[PDB]
Amino acid sequence: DFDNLFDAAIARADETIRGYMGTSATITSGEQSGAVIRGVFDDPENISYAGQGVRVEGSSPSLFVRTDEVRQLRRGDTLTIGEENFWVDRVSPDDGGSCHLWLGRGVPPAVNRR
Amino acid sequence: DFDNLFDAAIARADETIRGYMGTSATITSGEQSGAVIRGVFDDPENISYAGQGVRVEGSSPSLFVRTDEVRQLRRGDTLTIGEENFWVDRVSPDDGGSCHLWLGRGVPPAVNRR
Amino acid sequence: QLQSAIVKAMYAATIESELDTQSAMDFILGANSQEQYAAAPVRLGGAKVPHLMPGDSLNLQTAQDTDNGYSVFEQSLLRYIAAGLGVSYEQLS
Amino acid sequence: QLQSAIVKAMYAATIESELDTQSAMDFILGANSQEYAA
Amino acid sequence: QLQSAIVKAMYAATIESELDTQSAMDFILGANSQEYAAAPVRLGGAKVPHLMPGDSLNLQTAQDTDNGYSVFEQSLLRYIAAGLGVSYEQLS
Amino acid sequence: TRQEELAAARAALHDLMTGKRVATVQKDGRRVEFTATSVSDLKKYIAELEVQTGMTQRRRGPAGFYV
Amino acid sequence: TRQEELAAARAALHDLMTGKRVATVQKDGRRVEFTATSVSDLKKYIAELEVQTGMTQRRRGPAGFYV
Amino acid sequence: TRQEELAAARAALHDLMTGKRVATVQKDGRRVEFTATSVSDLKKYIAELEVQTGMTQRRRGPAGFYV
Amino acid sequence: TRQEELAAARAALHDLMTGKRVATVQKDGRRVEFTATSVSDLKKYIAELEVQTGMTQRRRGPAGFYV
Amino acid sequence: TRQEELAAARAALHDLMTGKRVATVQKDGRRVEFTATSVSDLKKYIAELEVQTGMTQRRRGPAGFYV
Amino acid sequence: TRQEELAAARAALHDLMTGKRVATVQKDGRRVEFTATSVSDLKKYIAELEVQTGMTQRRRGPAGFYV
Amino acid sequence: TRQEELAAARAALHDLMTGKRVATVQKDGRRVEFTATSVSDLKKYIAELEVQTGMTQRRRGPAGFYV
Amino acid sequence: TRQEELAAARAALHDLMTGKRVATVQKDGRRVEFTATSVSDLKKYIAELEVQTGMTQRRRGPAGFYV
Amino acid sequence: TRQEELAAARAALHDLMTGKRVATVQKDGRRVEFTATSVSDLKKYIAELEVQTGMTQRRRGPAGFYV
Amino acid sequence: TRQEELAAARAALHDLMTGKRVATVQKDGRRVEFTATSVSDLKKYIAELEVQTGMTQRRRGPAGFYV
Amino acid sequence: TRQEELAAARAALHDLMTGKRVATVQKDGRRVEFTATSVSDLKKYIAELEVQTGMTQRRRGPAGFYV
Amino acid sequence: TRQEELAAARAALHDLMTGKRVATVQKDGRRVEFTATSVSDLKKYIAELEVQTGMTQRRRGPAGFYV
């Protein structure tokens, strides 16, 4: 399928890591709508200060799922990591066998397109 | 308990290191009020100069508690470590099995909510 | 001692295949050709040199000598009772 | 005891190989497969 | 010495297998398990077995049942013959 | 739970046999390792639990001899 | 409390046998590695406490010969 | 399903034989290390599943001698 | 204090057997490692401590014979 | 497909023997290695399919003796 | 200080054989390593130290025989 | 395609013998590794190939004797 | 200068045996490592220096025999 | 080209023998390795190659005896 | 000047014996390593340089016998 | 050209023998490794080259006996 | 011109065995190392150069016997 004798190797590794850590989740709204997706979730830290001090500590969710499922996602669509809901903000370009999914929190902010 | 095979494995990792490293914490006030929590304490350094010479050397305590037993700690609540007392300032989100607790010193500063 | 002599001689050899018994003897010892458990008897023909692959072996036990001092030890006890019975040893034994 | 002597004397030689069973006899024990019982 | 000779002969073979001992007897020492004194075994032909890897059928060679014991009696019998005065060959 | 235990161990042999037993897996800052069991030892374990469970016969009692 | 840990030991053997004996686990600056045993030592170990407890027979008084 | 693994194993045998059995594939921040087995025991696994598979004959009943 | 010493050894055996005896722990700036001892050493030590302490009989004397 | 299997093996021996059995490659974080294979077993592997396939005779049988 | 050092050595042996012979300790910016000893040597050291110490009987002068 | 690869292999023997068998070659971020083979088998792969090629003889049929 | 020598050497033996012979130390840039000896050699050194020093008899001559 | 091969091999043996066989050489970001052969194989690699050439008598036949 | 190294080596032995023979020392880029020597060859070096120097008698001419 | 390396190799031995046989030297960003041989082989290399060189007598044919 | 090397060798011998044969040096970008010889060969090396040098007899020949 892949003319590199390596892509099948790394992609198969991608199956193992997602199967061996990072739980599974499901999509809400969007083209995929109801569908179950397994990836690897994590939440680092990020603090901004703005004025004299307005510390607004938050998070930065990421998924790292293979690209084939995450096709035709766009940005306005939402999803939930089990009990907790999120919404796609940015989709990383294909690494070669997968890509990263960057999520917000709560309701996606408006549209503001036209 | 969770579709990881890894978090449950690393769940064992945190409990032993929290047993092997650090001490117990006697939380005071807050909704938890009287409770005892195990954690690993460390107090790095930090020097600020402000004006010409205004060295205000202090420290930034940390606890690394397990998130299960420290839910809804909130922020204003204080905490006594051994014979000395601190007050929590930030509770980080869980890395997967535990988080970091950022401690102030002395009394918590006011409320200033309204 | 008599029973021990049988069993020590009763187990001539052994086979060390990881396959099933029925396939093993059909490949190493022969047999099969059944009519229609007790495993399978083997015809005593001749020669019958078997082919093998790694992981399998046919080891035949050397057992041990059947009179490792038995007969001489037998004489000593026989002498003992022979004196006790008051009759000559050579007559009794 | 007599039976044990038979079987122990019967299996005289043995050959092992990853090759085909039929092929081995052809290249080792002479064989006559060129023209049940092995 | 006679008693020690009995036991050394009375144990001939050993069975080493992580398999349950009941199946071990069935698949190695013939057995008649289709029928707690374990299980008897019928005396028959060679019954060569097919022990699995990791098993063994060690046969204990024991030792010379009369490793000098008769000769040792010769010395003792002579000595006791002196005590009783009767010639040793008459005694033994 | 023997029957699935049979299936699990037997499959565990196969994927290990070809290429597919994961000795360890690393994601940046999060890696785990597993003790690499041998192959021979597993087959004894494989052989052990199949006979003790309700699985069918796989070996019979020695072999007689007749002229 | 012998029986429950006996089952746990049996489970650990199964986990160790296929793929699940976790040797070490790594997080961002957080790692621990447990000591790793053999397989045979565990097999004799589990064999040790199953006989001492009240479960069914697995050993029989040698074997006799009749004719 | 014997032919599936049988074909897979022999393909793996050939794959492992020349150059292609990869014990570890590395992508930045993603290491997956498989275990590896020797060629011999791999052939033994090959040597077992096919004979219990109802494929063509591969074994023969020793060899008799005639003058 | 032999009784709790045995109990600690009893615990120190089973946890070591399955998965629990941790070789070392690292906490990103603080880590300690402990020497690993053989399973045989534990069994010998726990046994000799067991026989010397106040618990009941485990092993009797040599066996005799009678017709 | 034995012939191409044999042909791949032929180059596999020759390239490995001289300089070309690639142990591993490394594209700046995109690295992979392969399990090394001995030389004898590869010759053994290349030996068995050689006769197994429809290739010509390469080894005759025994040897006579006449005065 | 015979009793003191003997008790200290026994406690060290106990913790070592259970889980607590700290091989090396590292706190960021510093680390030390205590050398590791065997266990049989430690046990025989314990034995010689105690028999040297003024404690009670531990050995017996061979053994006799009588009908 | 036999004599020329023999010539390359024969050169490879000399290349490997003195100083020039490249084992690992490394560039910035890009590097590949070649497997290492002992000389004897390489000589074997040279020697046994001389017999099976049509080149000149180097072996003689034993050796007789005469007074 | 032999009595304090033997005393220090015996103390070193004791601490090494228990837990307290540090081989390697390091302070964020400054580190030292010492060569490590065995236990038997240290003990025999202790014995020979003790018998050479002014300490009284410890080992007596061979034992005779009387009816 | 055999004669200069002897010259090359003889030179390569010498400098290797003293100090001048480079195992590997690294310039920042560009490092290569060379497999190191033994001496005895190299020594005989000298031997069989010069006797193969037209080089003068190096070894002679077996020695006889006479009274 | 033979007694100086006699004292030096003997002092080195005790320095080596207890804990103090520094295998190597490093200080933030300034680091040297000293090759290690075992205790045996050290002592058997102590065993002769003193006998060849004017040290007192330490060896006696075999031993005689008398009833 | 036998004298130059004869002196060179013997000097190389002495430089190697004491402390000076450098196997690698690492300038900042520029390092190179020289593999080193044994000493007996070098010593043999010394012997063979000097005798084939027109050096004086160093060996004598057997040894006679007279009453 | 052999005495100085003899002096150099034994001087190299003494410090190497005590503490002072530097295995490698380090100057944060300027580091080297040397091959380490054993002590057995060095004693042989000093011995063989000792006798060949103009120094007098050290080891006499055989030994006489008389009544």
Swiss-Prot record, chains A, B:
Can you say where in the cell this protein is located?
Virion; Host cytoplasm
The processes (GO biological process) annotated in the record are: virion assembly
What are the alphabetically sorted keywords of the record? Answer: Host cytoplasm, Late protein, Viral capsid assembly, Viral release from host cell, Virion
Q: Report whether Zinc shows up as a keyword of the record.
A: no
Instruction: Name a single GO cellular component.
Output: host cell cytoplasm
Ion transport recorded as keyword: no
- This protein's superkingdom? Viruses
Q: Where are the transmembrane segments?
A: none
InterPro entries in alphabetical order: Phage_Head-Tail_Connect_sf (IPR053734), Phage_tail_attach_FII (IPR008018)
- Explain the purpose of this protein: Plays a role in virion assembly by joining the head and the tail at the last step of morphogenesis. Six FII proteins probably bind protein W that closes the DNA-filled capsid, as well as the U tail terminator protein of the pre-assembled tail.
Q: How does it assemble?
A: May bind head-to-tail joining protein W and protein U.
Please identify the protein, giving its name as recorded: Head-tail connector protein FII
Q: Which organism is it from?
A: Escherichia phage lambda (Bacteriophage lambda)
Curated annotation (Swiss-Prot), chain D:
Taxonomic classification, please?
Viruses, Duplodnaviria, Heunggongvirae, Uroviricota, Caudoviricetes
- Report the leader peptide range: none
Localization annotation: Virion
Q: What is this protein called?
A: Portal protein B
Q: Tell me which family the UniProt entry assigns to this protein.
A: Belongs to the siphoviridae portal protein family.
**What about PTM?**
Proteolytically cleaved by the viral protease during capsid maturation.
What is the stated purpose of this protein? Forms the portal vertex of the capsid. This portal plays critical roles in head assembly, genome packaging, neck/tail attachment, and genome ejection. The portal protein multimerizes as a single ring-shaped homododecamer arranged around a central channel. Binds to the terminase subunits to form the packaging machine.
Describe which stretch of the whole protein the shown chain covers, with first residue, last residue and complete length: 268 to 320 of 533
Where on the tree of life does the source sit, at the highest rank?
A: Viruses
Q: Subunit structure of this entry?
A: Homododecamer. Interacts with the terminase complex composed of two small and one large terminase subunits.
**Gene behind this protein:** B
Curated annotation (Swiss-Prot), chains F, G, H, I, J, K, L, M, N, O, P, Q:
Q: Which GO terms describe its cellular component?
A: virion component
Q: Which GO terms describe its biological process?
A: viral life cycle
What protein name does the entry list? Head completion protein
Protein's job: Plays a role in morphogenesis of the virion head after genome packaging. Presumably interacts with the portal vertex to stabilize the packaged DNA within the head after packaging. Probably binds to the head-tail connector protein FII.
User: What is the annotated quaternary arrangement, including any partners?
Assistant: Monomer in solution, assembles into hexamers on the prohead. May bind FII and portal protein (Potential).
Is Iron among the key words of this record?
Answer: no
Classify the source by domain of life: Viruses
**Sequence similarity:** Belongs to the lambda phage gpW family.
The record's keywords, sorted A to Z, are: Late protein, Viral capsid assembly, Viral release from host cell, Virion
InterPro entries given in the database record: GpW (IPR004174), GpW_sf (IPR036626)
Location of this chain's protein in the cell? Virion
Pfam families linked to this entry: gpW (PF02831)
